[model samples]
Structure formats: structure tokens, C-alpha cells
Target: KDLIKDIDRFVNGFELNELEPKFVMGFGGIRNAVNQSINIDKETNHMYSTQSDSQKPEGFWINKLTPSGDLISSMRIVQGGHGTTIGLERQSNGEMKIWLHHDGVAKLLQVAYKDNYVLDLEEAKGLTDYTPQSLLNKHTFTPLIDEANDKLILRFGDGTIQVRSRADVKNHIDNVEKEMTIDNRWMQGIAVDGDDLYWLSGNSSVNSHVQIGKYSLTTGQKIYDYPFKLSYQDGINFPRDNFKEPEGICIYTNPKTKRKSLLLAMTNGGGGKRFHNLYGFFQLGEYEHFEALRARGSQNYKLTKDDGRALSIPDHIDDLNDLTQAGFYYIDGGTAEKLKNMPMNGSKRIIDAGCFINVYPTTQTLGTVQELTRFSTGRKMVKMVRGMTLDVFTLKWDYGLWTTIKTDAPYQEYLEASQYNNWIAYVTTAGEYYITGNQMELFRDAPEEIKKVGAWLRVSSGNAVGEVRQTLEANISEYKEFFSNVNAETKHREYGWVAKH
Candidate 1:
């Protein structure tokens, strides 16, 4: 009983206090759980959240949170479906209308309020089915708008593509029947700049083919395709023979060289037959190796060693004359070797490259990547890099250059970060938050009450060598005061607080 009493004393001494000094002291674990489906309305400082998960809730909701992490307002629109992606645009009426895409449909949810609280959600348009599954697959990327013609163009599925005017989209859901065939397989990515619309395709089930295609939105013509080499068999290709799955895609434009580069990050693919677990960037586009493959005729490349083994050409032709260089790489996590390999020179840019491994299949896995944004004025250029990591559906952004972002939750899905204005937002398995500005002012000082804790008081300014001794004595005093007070309250009172070794 005496031994047990001593054990209890030691254990209870280290437990957290649940009273008076409310919040946890000295930065234990504070995170920004900003919902990623919504985008920041910079003009109004409001965050709009959408219900776009096909298997989740139906109506769309908008929420406003202060930069310091306070929920200000929330509103919900009753339109039903699995809402997944949200796009916000200011309407001509000076009110902000949120456009939501769910399943394969698109609708508008308008915000209204009663006094200071949001109390109303009115549907701005009837449910409009944008793309059918036969033409494309589920999960469409961001859409591009043509204001002059009031047209909206989107890439869907494996090879499906479509465009509809604002009026045509609204009227079709009410009365007209429309049918179109587009060639999209699992169209997972979309981006439009000027007159060109870019699309990326991948299959999630197996290690197979991955491709990027471009179309001239102005003339509605398919222009080029860039196919990445992937392997499902062992002892075949170099890195891809071990590649697991291919996913997120993004394009970076370099002003100095007047060059545009493509970046693709894949899920961890185990190494070739010899090495079972290895994954990293697999080069695509017109690298010297791929150019050599092109010289051998991309269509006639061998797929296997058998007599009938000829490499199957991708369904589309890729244009490489415009591409200057291509490879798979990643930023190093502050290691001396990684720092030395960073792209600091003009002639040869060191491509960031590495591999990640997953130990458990059932657990959610987190993936991370960084994007470097360079802005120039006159002859001087300033570069900013943002790091992002994914856990389930939540995305976290670390400002500046970070070697890694850590999370315990199971990883779901992740998208490479996207840059808008000067801010970047990356998507992961969980939620998403943008990486912007320094947080020095937001968390510069420690709480006054926390500094008063007995444990804190004894070790606050002691030299490191003697700090442990001081803390031990302070803990003993705290336990004595706690139990002495309890024993005085009753004749046979049970005493609890104690110190342990």
C-alpha cells in the first residue's frame, strides 16, 4: 500500500491542471483547422465553406473566421447534393454568390442575414447537371470563365471536355435536353491561362499510364499530350518499375528563362523488383532520356522482351519542342546534402527530388511538397517557398522553407499547393489553410497566469544543470499543500496529490 501510494503521488504530480488557468500553457498544440473547400474573400475577409463531398451533406455552407482563429458567422443553403468544390465570385448586384459543384452538378448559393447572424440561404439557380459520367468520370477540377461570351469551360473524367454559357446552363436544367461526348478518362486536374486549357489524367486503382493534355479553348481543338512512363511490372523501367501511384499536378513559370515547367507528385510507389518499398519523382516531358526514347519513335518502343512485345503508344501525341527540361525532384529537409543541391544557379536548375514510404495500408498517410514562388522588380528578385502537408482531408501550410510537416491522422488524398496572388493553398486528406505572413505578433508573449504555476516558478530562471533539482522540490511543496488542505477538511479524508521520481 505504501509503494502504491508513492506511485500515485509521482503520477498525479505530472498531470495537467483542469482548473482556473483555463488554456494550456506555453504552446502545446495549437493548429488552424480552416475548412479547405472554401476560399478567402480577400476584399471582405470572409471564408466561405461548401458541402461538396458526394457522400456527405447536401446543402452549401459559408463560414467567416478571423485571422486569429475565431468563428464570426455561418450560413447554410438548402440546395441538396454531395457538394465537394466551391468557387466564389462577386455578382453584379454587389452581393457575393457562391458557386458549388457536387457530384456532376453545379448550383449557386446566395448569402443573406437576419440582423447580425446569417439566417437565410436561397438557391440562386435550379440544379444543373454539367457533365455526365459516360462522357467523363467523377471529380472535376477548377473551371475557367469567359466573361465576354458568358461561357464556362471545364475538363472532366479521363478525356471529357465541355463548355456552356451562363444562360444555357441555367435553361438546360429547367427544360432543354443536351447531349455531348467528350473524351475524359479520370480527368483529375484543370487549369486555363489565356487561350490554353490544360488537363491531367490518372487511374487510382493500379500503377498505369499518367498523361497531361492541352487544348485551345478558343478553337476547341486538342493540341498536345505529355505522357509519363509508368510500370506495373518488376525489373522493367528504372524508377517507375517501383512507382506506386501517380496523383497531383501543377505548372510553374520561370520568367528569367521564359520557360514553363510542370511538376507532378505521385503517391509512394514501391521500388523495382529488387527494392520493394521506394517512391519519388519520375521524370516526364522532354528530358534527354525521353528525347532519346522519342528519337527511337515513341510508338515503336518495346514494352516487353517477348516477340510480340512492342510498347503501346499513348492515345495522344505529346509536343516537346516547347519544353526545355523535365525531371522528378523535391526540396531537401534542411540536410546539408539537400541544401547543397538546391537550384541556386542560372544555367542548371537543381530539380528537387526524393522518395517517401508508407508502412501501414489501413492507416491514413500524409504527403508533403513545397512550391517556390519568385517575384522580381527591376534587377533584383525575391523568392518565397511554401511547404504543405496532407493528413486525410486536412491540409496544413508552413510558411517559409520547412523540411517537413508532421501529422498523426491517416492520409486521405493530397493536391500540390496552388498559388494565387502571393498566397498558396495546398490540399491534403483533411482540410486546408493558406501559408501567408509571419505570426510573430500573433503569439509573441506567454500568458501571465501560466507563469505563476508552482512548477513553472521553481524552474523559470535556474541554470540548466540545477533546473531538475529545483523542479523536484517545487513539485514536493505543491503536493504537501494540496494534501494537507484536504486532510484538514475531514477526520478521515482521502489525500490524492503526490510526487513521483
Candidate 2:
């Protein structure tokens, strides 16, 4: 500890504890960031990819930010890349992996969250002969990280299904190992419930098709495949049918019963037109679904019977004028429920990816959507509609209002710190919010102008979170003279615990 005393604030390298989040202390141990993908630790010290490419050296950095806002820790996350969603925890040997586990869909679904998705001591000891990579290939899609019965599921379905043991999670992977692989093709969205893996597809070559299928890990068998097509009304009593592409999916279980495995799916619209506003499909507990899934799984699910009521076939809706016969209506009241004609939002897209996310401190998961397209400008932005209005009823009562579009206000890299779906990494308030980014800072020549992240941290039951918010403009300008002489060499090896004004 070489000698700098009474430092008022950090000119750079801030920690997040200043805000004192009552519920969350860290991202667990995560340390990477992507525009739409990330994996962090609660997980801290810190690591985040500065640029959008993992192919480049030093594209990532650690000890970046924390819940305290300005105060942060510098920790190593082991490995990942641009857009890789991350998750980790100590193994029996005590090390974290970028993901505890994918491929278009692979590049789109890498999940890095702060939670209990880790290997136990005995489980960690079970892994052998693996060397983890510090950085993996850029997911053309960011890969999806999922788990079931101590087995990790990765690159779920774009034709290949990857599974690994929890013991092997952080124990190793330069490339990746697998318990097995499925030759499933055109698989888009994926999920793991207990010992089963689920995926959706409409047969990429056949526009007139749509289907959802599931597989069992215990016996390695295909449970069932449900298929359908999209048809609608013309508002004048006439009906029409057309093929839409199947895009995304997710499984929701009753928090209490734990057996109601509600499976849902959506289709991408065609020709600049979206699918019928309410056009979608879902299966109630199948007659035999979740029957033999792992018992330790907290998410309870089971399949029941199939009948007109169970496999609800609504003969009428506002969209299918001909009294069409399927998509979103009744249920195992058993097979698949379909909504006939229904007057709903018509704008849709070439659907591709989706899943639930960690909203933190709650069982309520974030239901989401994604549309893929190529602009003449040659830039593709993945537009997501995140339904932040947790659980069923809130989403049912007022879906639109509860969701935030774009979610980002002041467009800048600093606001994108590995804090995508969670809370801000660091905060400071005695003055104002400053800037921090790879090669960007509050002092010295900033890479860009100061901007605010339009986010709110409601420490409701207890504290008030401000500082970096209130002091935006005052950031590093007012005290430029006091900082002008400071250089990168002054960066303390243990700087971020507190600020030096």
C-alpha cells in the first residue's frame, strides 16, 4: 500500500457497493459483456469484454464494476466471449467457468446470470480431463447456458444438442465435451426442465409447418412432437391460411404445484406482416410429460390427458373469418391449445430466439421475444420485447404498458457495463455519476461525452440510490486540475474499494 490518503472519489475504476443494494451483493463472479449477451458473477471483482469481438485479444477486462456503483472488484471469470451469456460458482476444486454450458440460436442465447447454477463438491470432483478456454468462439448466435439433473445443456438445438456433467462445468473446456448430441435440425429456441430438453422449429424449408419437440435424458428417447400451421380470418367472415415460421419458446411451472409444465411457442410473421396478434401455441401438462424428469428439480411439471377441452381448439377468433380451428384457446382442461380467428397485432418478423431471464430477488421470470432481419444499411439490430411485468396476471391485464422497449436511453458503452438484465454494477452519490469504459474514463481524455443510463434502482424497503445519477455533469470536469497530474501508473493495484477525490 504505497501512500495515497483521504482520496475523496475515484477518477476511474469504481465499485458498486456505494448504492448498498439490500438484496443483491454481486453478479456472483461474472466478468464479460456483449450488446445483448453477458455472464457475470454475484458474483464479482469483475470482467467485461470492452469491444464487441472475442476474437481480439484483451477484448475483455476484469474488476470493472459492482453494485456499489463506483466501488468494484477485479476478479477473473476463467473464460467466455463477445455475447456469451455467463454463469459460475466455486467447484470442489474452487474455480468458476464462463458457463456451467451452444450454436444461429447458439450466438443468440448465451446466458450469464447470478444464481445457484453451480456444481457441488462431489459433483465438481466427478469431472476430469478437461482444460477450460479463457475465451470461446463468438456465438454467431451467443450460446444458451442451461442445466438439468446436474447435467449442463449447451448450444441446445441448431441441429446439434450438447450436454455435459456439472462436475465438468468449470473443471474444463477449450472446445467443449458432451454427454451426447442430437442430429435435430433447424432447432431455434431451447430449454431444460429436469431431465428433458425442448426445442421448436417449423422446418426451415417448409413454410407450411411448425412443431415443438422434447427429449428425455435418462433413457435418451424422443417423447413427442406436436405440429401445426397458421390460419386466420379476413374480418368479413372469410378465412385464410398461410405458413409462418416458428421462432421462440419457454416452459413455465406453477410455483406451488410444481407439476404444471406450461409450454409456449410463437411464429415469425411473413412478408413484412407479423403473425395474427394472438397467434401462438401452448401445451398443458401432457398425459406423460415430466413423468420421469429428475425429482430434485424444484420446477415441477407433468403431462395429463388430451381432449377437446384439454387440447383446446377454438373454432372462432377475430382473425380467422372462416372459423378456423387452432392456436391459443382452451387446454388439458390436454394436447395443444390453438386460437382460431382473433383480431390482434399483425406486425411480426422472421422470428429466431428467446428465453426467461433473472429479474433478481423474485421467482417471476422475464418472458421475452426477438426478431431477425437484415437492413439495406447492412446493420442488424436484435430488437427484443422484454415483458418485465413478471408472472401471469400482470402480463395478462396490461402486457404493453408493463414492458420497456429498447430499455436503453442515453446510448453509450458505459451504460452497457455487464448490467444488462440486472442492477447497475456500481454507484457513487456525494457528487455525480462519472464515466467508465474500456479505455474511456471520468478523467483524462474521455472516448466520448458523458451520458446517463436511464435506469432506476429502487432500494424501496430501505435505502435511497443516487450519486452517479445526480452528479452526471459534474463527473470529471469540475476537478480536472486535481486529476490532470494523475496518470495510469497511479492506478492502485487495489483501487476500487473506495474513491479518491
Candidate 3:
């Protein structure tokens, strides 16, 4: 109680989310873990974790064992985001990027830079003198990371889209090389396929009709007016008092053929309140379940409903309403899963939701990576990806825990216990998920607490935690010294580069 309250007399009763502060310390711990994994003694296959053969485990970060079972030394080569609220978009090597959301100049920070600084307690926590990097102008929202083309996207609500070369992100620079505009300023969802860019006019009043737009990555030209509509009018529940408007957008394609699905999150269109109670069902019958679909232009393709009837190309999508329970639903795939949060005393809600990969694979190893990049500000290539799920889900529940539908099978279909939950946190067996493929699967185990244990340990590390807490306190004491004067001093072209060796 004393710690959670934090010396503020007004809010002294606030409960603690953790025993100790996280962030810098957490990154310190992760850096140590990766260092332990990387510093392999080729002869013994044991890792050197500490400064010298004399360093003990308690005083150092992580400890590794040799083939002969000797507890070898371990230490950190760089810093990492013990945890981040902006979500992790790129997960490659010890170096990764995270967004601070509302920071002025340095909205983006490559975590490895923490090592480059000279600090008090962090020296023992694992510090490396390498480099620094950051870039941001506004409330940057999301990215389209395409390794195939070698460019990364950075978007802002001002209807401006900045395109930076992969060089600027991993290397260094000032403003992005290119900038463009959205058809509608407030683009809630975005997807990139090859040279084509797609986004939806999410809640943007300026755009007259709720619409979908396309653009060229090479030319930055706003082009194309695809004709299509959702069957929400005649279908969904709430007595025509509602509909799941197209607020979020995503596009997936077959690796082999041209088979594709443009999945748009048809959210609630009621009470002037958007982005909540997002439910979906696919093809289930008898009940008011979920069902969804599409049509064409040149050939005038036709759609068939499950009730055994082929309907003509409905002139306006606003006219139909037969989306079944199986059509839209919880993020879980290919199953009849139901997730409802009903806490009598409190509320269950999604703090934030976006696209993310569930599994991660070490390079060349048999694991998955971010097949689908994020629509939020953080848009680096997500690494160690196994399965794809629309996540970076910030869920808050006042009631104890999230529950799922129990089934005939032994496994109780609940939060971490199942492949995917209503909150969209997912785990998979394939070790890799192709973002656009229907072959996505579930995980053998994914408990919420267990999933966070790794990060929690880092944040609460004995040595790093203390240093992180102190450094942060000192920064707050002189915010102007660091966030401004110092922020401006570090030239984008210099003082922030990495060393390979």
C-alpha cells in the first residue's frame, strides 16, 4: 500500500500492479537474457554471463550453464524494453523499436540505445556504450513494414503518411524521406500488399461515405474505388438500432494462388460510440450467428447465403443484414467459440486492440514471426512470430478473470488455456503464422500470468530495477534537461549508431 500510493496523499490507496517499477530495469534484464543466450563458448557450448569468472549469479543479470554443468558467467550486451505500452512491432536480435505514444521529439526509441548512456547503478545492471536513435513528430499511429520492398511506413492522424527507408529505422536520420495523404484523414485500419496500400476511413467526418481507399506505394497516388458492402442492415442484432460499421481493415492473400480475403472489423454503429462490443460469427445457422461475404466488378460475381439461396448483387450493402454467428466473432479461428465478460461489480473492456503475431522463431530455427505487422504506431518487423492474431490487446477487467465456453473436450476453453480468446491474446503450435493464411492454429499453453513472467522478471530485476527507477526519477527531476535541451543536442545524423561485433 505504501509503495503503490507513491507519496501522493490524494491517491494513496492505489493498488500495486507490480512490486517494483518496470521499463528500463525490464529492458536491462532482457538484455542480460539475450546476452546469456548469445555469448556461447563454442568449445564448451556454455554461456559466459558475468564480467569475469569470479562474478556470481546474485550480483549479475543472468546465469548460463556449460556442457559440464558449470554455472558460467553472464551479462548484458545491450538494453531492451523490459515492457512497452506502445507494443513491440519489430522483434529481431537484441535491437527492437517501441513507441512512447505521446513523446514530442523521440516518439520512437531503439531500446539498445540505453546501453550507450553513462549512468550510476545501471553499470552493474549491464550497460554497453553503443549508440542512440529516435524519430517522431506527432501522435504517430501505425506502420506497413515490407522487407520485400525495403521501406517502413509511419502514419499520423493529420492525414499524413511518412515513408522511411529501412536505413532510417535501423541506421539513422531526421524526417522521413517521403510523405503522403490518406483519402480520409482518420484512417483506423491499414494493410499493405506488394505495391498496393489500403486503409479505411475510420470515423473521419470529413469523408462523406464510410469508405475504403487504395494507393500506390511508389507514386503515393490516391487511386481506386473498390465497390463492395457488408450485409449488416438486414442481418445483425439490436433490432436495426445498430450495425457493425467497417472501422478496422485487413487484407490477406494466398501464398500460392490469388485467393484473398479483405477482413474489415464491422464494429457497432450506435450511440455515437464506436470501437466497442466488436463481435463476429461465421456461417452458423438456426441462431442469430455470424456470417459475412463479398462480390465483384468486371464479371459481377454473385454471393450465396447458407440458407440455400443465391442473392443478386445487392445494389447497396446497406440493404442486407444476414451476417451469421459464425461470420464474425472472437479472434479464435475455425471454431464456435463464445467469450462474454459479465462482472457484476465491474466492467470488462479492451483497452486497445491491433494486429500482432503470437509466436516467435529464432532466425533459421523452426519458429514463426510477425506475418502481420501492426496498425498502431510501432511498425517494425515483428520477430519470433509463431501464429498471427490481431493483438497488442490492452484488456482491463474488474471481475477476477476471463472465462470461456467449456466443451466436451478436456481442455476448458478459456483465456490463455485456448488458442485465442475474446481479448485476442493467442498462442499457436505451428511456430509460424502466415498473416494472410487460413491455416492458423492454437497454442498448447498460454496463461496470462505465465506469458508475462518473462517480462516481469526483467522489470523487477535486483540490479537493473533499482537503476531504472533511480534514472527515471532523476530524469523527471529535470525533464527539460533531457527531453528538450539534450533531445535537441543529439543530432539525428550522429551519436546513435550500433556496432555489429
lDDT by residue (tens digit), candidate 2, 1-501:
323432323222112112111111112113232122222222232322111224332222232333222223333222223323233332444354444222211121113332323322333333442223423453332233442244455553244545655555445533344444554446545555666666566543343455656677665677777554433334211223343333334333333333323233232234433331112222232213222221222233221123332222233432222222222232220111122321111111111122111122222353332111111122222222322233466433223311222322333323323232221223211111224443223223221233221212211111232112212232343331111111111221121212123
Give TM-scores for every candidate, taking all chains together and pairing residue i with residue i. Answer: 0.30, 0.29, 0.30
TM-score, structure 3 vs. true? 0.30
lDDT of 1 by residue, 1-501 (tens): 999987665533211111111110010001111122323343453434332212234443445444222346555444334333344455666566544443323323222322123222233344334433333354443343333344444444344445555455435432212212335356544444345555566654344566667767666666777665543334324343344443333333322332333334333334322211111121222123223322443334232334443222122413211111112222222321233323321222212232111111121333333332222222222232233334445543222232222222232211111211111110111112211112111211212222222221111221233111112122224342211111111212123223342
Q: Across residues 26-71, which tens digit of lDDT does each residue of candidate 3 receive?
A: 0011221211111222223232221111122212223343422234
After aligning candidate 1 to the native by TM-score, how far in Å is the CA of 474 from where it should be?
21
C-alpha positional error of residue 365 in candidate 3 after TM-score superposition, expressed in Å = 39
Candidate 3: residue 143 Cα off by (Å): 3.9
Better of 1 and 2 by TM-score: 1
Worst 10 residues of 2 by lDDT: 19-28
Model 1 residue 395 lDDT? Answer: 43
In order, candidate lDDTs are 0.32, 0.31, 0.30
